Design a protein around this ligand. Structure first.
Ligand SMILES: Cc1cc2nc3c(=O)[nH]c(=O)nc-3n(C[C@H](O)[C@H](O)[C@H](O)COP(=O)(O)OP(=O)(O)OC[C@H]3O[C@@H](n4cnc5c(N)ncnc54)[C@H](O)[C@@H]3O)c2cc1C
Ligand SMILES: Cc1cc2nc3c(=O)[nH]c(=O)nc-3n(C[C@H](O)[C@H](O)[C@H](O)COP(=O)(O)OP(=O)(O)OC[C@H]3O[C@@H](n4cnc5c(N)ncnc54)[C@H](O)[C@@H]3O)c2cc1C
Ligand SMILES: C[C@H]1C[C@@H]2CNC[C@@H]2N1C(=O)C(C)(C)C
Ligand SMILES: [Br-]
Ligand SMILES: [Br-]
Ligand SMILES: [Br-]
Ligand SMILES: [Br-]
Ligand code: NA
Lengths: 489, 486
């Protein structure tokens, strides 16, 4: 049996690696090999063909947030005249998970079909690692002593193995799970603690809160004062109030010290503060780390950053000439469309002789919390460090449908941050139903260097939440040499 | 007799922007006249305008209400269980809630007048007595009792529009959108007449709230509803309305209506077909509301269509008389009317001449599912440019394979000047389309090109990200003819 030769070998058939592989083969005629550990979603390895987003990430989680939103629709319909037996209402978690599994498996099979079909785009099942500068080895397991399935010769090698949930070293960590297992729980937990203040912990808290059985309770804990570091502070505070208003307990300044099993098998969580909490599930969502350890990068000398990701330049090159890295393995912005963009830019540069580098600024993104967040660009405290004078335009209003729905607590917030010197928009931050869909074209605006007056000159679509972005023209306050103030001196 | 810098006839969308801006931004003395202080019969429009009282605001609420019919059914695919036969749609509760929400806005507009210097409200019917005098009478009758005589350095006409009713025997047995907002009972069988957004939106409303055994029909005299919108989208929304139980009668037009012994209506079409319904709602158009203004006293000119004639700065033929909003018979939208008012006040009372841009205006249809659009449809662009590209995406989103509403295709279309890639128009159909389109209106003011959309990183997973993944045209127009290749 002979080794096989390729122009590009890709390790990891995920968001970035599939984009790079498809494009190299179909746009430029190269011969491409792509490696992944599993052909379809779920245990044992969770991620598989298609990547983390497709299998245990954006796609399943957005289906489950959608299912969770119906708790709000069913209740809110009554303000509009809808009547039904409220006592008969049941959230069937098994049906949600079965429907999600089926949709995900369909994408798995479609990816498998593409490979079986496409000229010069080949898939290989196993664990890829770097043997030498121009040879990828595929093994049966992650252990480098497991059996060799293939050796793939490669002029160019792309590292795109993604990331993995981080678990803290606490007594009883064996009793906790991560988001990977959360996607496959047989029954919805009566009491669940989600640990962490980031988007995964928040999104999952909203899912569990809608499907909990009668008498259930969702608790989110975070070790610092305010959840969702990195997002707009006004939105960080309002999303907390609205999560609380939907029945979620948010324990800030609290962090688990240990977990033990009660005699009945529930989990007994003890915090550093000495507080205790009994729950049926502890889901850790405290961060995600790049998957480097299994690539045997020492064999060829690929440098990692102090933080732990593969070091790359603006064109995704490592310190080894023909070896590249994109996506979550670079431990920077962990979003699917960034990985896809890096994959497309790398292939255009290397094989298309039209060079191009990914713009990591002004990336639009969303949090699918209930209610959701949309954001593009800088938060005000960051902009205030870089610009002499920053203006902040802010509109916070209850939409009219929530005058009737009951959920008067569902304020919509729109904020625009500018360079007050010339009116250039530095960032837009939104909270409320529709915010993820609204922000997308805001991203095109910022790539076109929109000023606040381009937003204000635009005639609104009425009645919408989004029209409030186009009717703001006096700042609510300023930052002058970093000092917040209602008025300019 | 009382003196004023500006007299505004009509306390509506454009008339209230212009009034308040004149008073608080330039310290002028302002009087605003309207026939009614809150919504509903007898005059329907009132303080706040058509949009507030019998337009965008109540219809958005009621459309929101009609969407729960789909939410209740779709929730099953995501595991939601409940007693489906226990479900009923209480129309009176909807109307009652809508009435209170509208009244709250009526009252807030009242306090605004009581709290603002140089801004007074007058109840009654305003008309032009002489070139600098506005009269307020008790009724629309030009002989009713004079309540006030306001003299104005400047007069602003902003009385909006009113439903058009065709001259067919039995028209008096038909209603318009005005009365639909106040029907005591949701109609069991109803015919909505017209292809425009009002017919289409109310059809979706009645369809959700109809009692058991009910049926909504929409008829339209030509072949395809929603003239003026994208043609792919007119065809799709027809299909998706039909999938949800609404009968679309194209190429049919009522010829007479008559009263049945049980109180229902018998409709005869020009084709000879007949239909018995409980309600016939005419939605065939809205016409400028000029008749009660006594424009003949001062000689304000009307275009042949009936709009007050204006220049780019809202000036009539009579100096110091202006007209904005639906009475100029142009784009009949609330944000256009507001923009027109503010530009007028900036020009007249500030040192800031300003005209409204009537191009690239984003707007929406709150049909189920809804439409969002900005700029040119492909066949209009094909008459203005030699080379036009059309980029298109249309599929059922994943969630609606699970929900079971698999007919719910999302459609996104981008129209470019292929010569330089400049985006001329964007057209959307599907949940969220009215919200997605807003910032697209901003992109078109920066002369975005298709490559600016495609080079922007997408938000995943959303419907909106489809707009940033279209690289290759689906087809083209060259010298006005449609073809798939260049
Ligand atoms: C719960 C959750 C929700 C998320 N939601 C969103 C969201 O809403 N929007 C968004 O933009 N992003 C979201 N993300 C992030 C998104 O999933 C990632 O940013 C994206 O998948 C990273 O793409 P990538 O190409 O770097 O790697 P991945 O998509 O992770 O693909 C890497 C692949 O490599 C394989 N692999 C690993 N090691 C090896 C090896 N040695 N040999 C062979 N194959 C290997 C893995 O099995 C995997 O398939 C979410 C993530 C999580 C965990
Ligand atoms: C059913 C319906 C739904 C709509 N939905 C939308 C939507 O979603 N989005 C959108 O942008 N547009 C919508 N519109 C259009 C919008 O309502 C109008 O474009 C807007 O109200 C026009 O504003 P205007 O300033 O011209 O006058 P209006 O807002 O109509 O105000 C005119 C006012 O003048 C008063 N008046 C009339 N005659 C006299 C007189 N002789 N003396 C004194 N006062 C008088 C009236 O009572 C009224 O209050 C809708 C319209 C309708 C009918
Ligand atoms: C509640 C506010 C703000 C919402 C966002 N834009 C539409 C909604 N509103 C209004 O249109 C009124 C007329 C009530 C001001
Ligand atoms: Br269940
Ligand atoms: Br401005
Ligand atoms: Br018609
Ligand atoms: Br037609
Ligand atoms: Na609204």
């Amino acid at each position: 049996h002979m080794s096989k030769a390729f122009d590009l070998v890709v390790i990891g058939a995920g968001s970035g690696g599939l984009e790079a592989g498809w494009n190299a083969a179909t746009l430029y005629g190269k011969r491409v090999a792509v490696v992944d550990v599993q052909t379809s979603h779920g245990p044992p390895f969770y991620a598989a063909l298609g990547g983390t987003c497709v299998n245990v990430g954006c796609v399943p989680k957005k289906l489950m947030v959608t299912g969770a939103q119906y708790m709000d629709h069913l209740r809110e319909s009554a303000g509009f005249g809808w009547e039904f037996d409220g006592s008969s209402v049941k959230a069937n978690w098994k049906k949600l998970i079965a429907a999600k599994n089926e949709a995900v498996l369909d994408i798995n099979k479609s990816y498998e079909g593409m490979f079986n079909d496409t000229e010069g785009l080949d898939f290989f099942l196993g664990w890829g690692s770097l043997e030498s500068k121009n040879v990828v080895v595929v093994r049966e397991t992650a252990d480098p002593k497991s059996a060799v399935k293939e050796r793939l010769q490669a002029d160019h090698i792309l590292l795109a193995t993604g990331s993995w949930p981080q678990m803290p070293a606490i007594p009883g960590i064996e009793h906790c799970i991560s988001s990977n297992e959360a996607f496959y729980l047989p029954e919805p937990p009566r009491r669940v603690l989600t640990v962490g203040g980031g988007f995964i912990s928040v999104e999952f808290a909203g899912i569990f809160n809608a499907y909990k059985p009668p008498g259930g309770k969702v608790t989110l804990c975070y070790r610092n004062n305010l959840i969702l570091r990195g997002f707009d502070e006004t939105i960080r505070e309002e999303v907390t109030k609205q999560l609380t208003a939907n029945g979620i307990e948010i324990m800030t300044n609290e962090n688990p010290a240990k977990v033990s099993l009660n005699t009945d098998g529930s989990k007994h969580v003890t915090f550093e503060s000495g507080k205790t909490l009994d729950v049926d599930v502890v889901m850790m969502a405290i961060g995600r780390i790049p998957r480097t350890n299994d690539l045997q990068l020492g064999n060829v000398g690929v440098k990692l950053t102090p933080k732990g990701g593969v070091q790359v330049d603006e064109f995704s090159r490592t310190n080894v000439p023909n070896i590249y890295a994109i996506g979550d393995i670079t431990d920077r912005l962990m979003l699917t469309p960034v990985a896809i963009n890096e994959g497309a830019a790398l292939v255009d540069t290397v094989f298309g002789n039209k060079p191009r580098k990914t713009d990591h600024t002004r990336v639009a993104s969303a949090v699918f919390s209930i209610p959701p967040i949309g954001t593009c660009g800088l938060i005000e405290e960051v902009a205030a460090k870089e610009f002499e004078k920053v203006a902040v335009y802010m509109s916070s209003f209850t939409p009219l449908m929530h005058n009737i729905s009951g959920s008067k607590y569902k304020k919509f917030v729109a904020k625009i941050v500018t360079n007050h010197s010339d009116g250039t928009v530095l960032g837009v931050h939104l909270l409320g139903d529709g915010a993820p869909e609204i922000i997308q074209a805001v991203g095109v605006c910022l790539r076109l260097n929109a000023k606040i007056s381009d937003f204000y000159n635009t005639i609104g679509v009425h009645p919408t939440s989004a029209e409030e972005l186009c009717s703001m023209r006096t700042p609510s306050y300023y930052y002058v040499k970093g000092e917040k103030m209602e008025k300019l001196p």
